[PDB]
Design a binder for this molecule. Structure first.
Ligand code: J4R
Length: 125
């Protein structure tokens, strides 16, 4: 069964827009979005559709680039580090639930390299 997707806005959580957050959406997210291995990470894991009845029994902090995209578009993050933590959570969840050698793991490893490749240099203030 699928839990509700992660929130992309919160009236109690303060919003903020920075140069690095604009960079994280314009170049980081949107380039990773166009990678050939991006399709398994563009939406929350549908455990019912994907026949993964144990996914949310294991993953208690799910994350995907679709949620990250909407959060960046809604200025959900306070700074760039909070957004980067969502990217790291998405990758770590994939390595936690799956095993080395899986196609999904090779695809997450390729996106993670390109992710670190593009956050290596961020704009200043
Ligand atoms: C467990 C795991 O780490 C996974 C993650 C983070 N994501 C997927 C995943 N698998 C998919 C298959 C198809 C699609 N599509 C194609 C059509 N398009 C419209 C978008 C939806 C999206 C998919 N995401 C898996 C996965 C690996 N094994 N399984 C059985 C699921």
């Amino acid at each position: 069964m699928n839990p509700p997707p992660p929130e992309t806005s919160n009236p109690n959580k303060p919003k903020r827009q920075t140069n690095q957050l604009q960079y994280l959406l314009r170049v980081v997210l949107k380039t990773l979005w166009k990678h050939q291995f991006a399709w398994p990470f563009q939406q929350p894991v549908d455990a019912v559709k994907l026949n993964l009845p144990d996914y949310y029994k294991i993953i208690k902090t799910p994350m995907d680039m679709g949620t990250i995209k909407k959060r960046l578009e809604n200025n959900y993050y306070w700074n760039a580090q909070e957004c980067i933590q969502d990217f790291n959570t998405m990758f770590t969840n994939c390595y936690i639930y799956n095993k080395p050698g899986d196609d999904i793991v090779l695809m997450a490893e390729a996106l993670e390299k390109l992710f670190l490749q593009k956050i290596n240099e961020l704009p200043t203030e």
